[PDB]
Amino acid sequence: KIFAVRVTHGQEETTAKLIYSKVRTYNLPIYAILAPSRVKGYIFVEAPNKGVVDEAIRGIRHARGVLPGEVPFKEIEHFLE
Template sequence: MSEPESSDGQQPESITEPVAEPEPVAEPEPVAEPEPVAEPKMETDGNSHLFAVRTTGGQEKIVMRLLEARIKMGKINIQSVVLLSDLKGYVVVEAQNVSAMFDAIQGIRHVRGQLRGELTYNEIDKYLIKKSTVSELAVENTVEIIGGPFKGMKATITRVDQEKEEATVILLDATYQLPVTVDANYLKLVPA
């Protein structure tokens, strides 16, 4: 294709404008890192105390879960919550002081109050550390079987194996002497 000619038969001159040098691009400013959100400061001077919180019977797990949720949200200043299966109607709370414990249980449903004073570690130690029942068993003791196929039956111990934590017993409820080897954790001493 040919370029258009002007009326006098000459081709038009191309008009060129001088190209300006590009301006230097300024270096971008470094982006400031967002500051981390500060977590609530908890007092941790190592002087925690144990308190027993009284709950509605059977609602211990609910109270414990509500306290755990408040701990995770950072709303309360307590270190731990312990639910002891043998201590019905109570939840043990570890806190720096009484006021921190009262702030923690304030407004929680099923909380009925708090025992006066503090608990000592020795008072709850027996609930926390499971002692082997084999050490309590002896030959000729009368026991009740609390687990397994013979649950609810009474028996007399004939032999105790400390290493395997087992005991051989003779069932008292059977019509003939039937020796059975049972895990020691399934045995409970019957008071004489």
């Protein structure tokens, strides 16, 4: 269940690293993080539900919010290929 979270377009690459570090602290049930550089200002996070991403997004200043609605996988193969 992929979700999209908006971040400031200055340090998206550092944002991925800090989620990758933060996932260990509370052992969040999150499968994978995506953040291609071709798309600016947003990241893709895999999580079972909205509560998980909401809990994993708190405490980060650059994380502004999470967009409503699931982003389908079908819309994103052109990037991971």
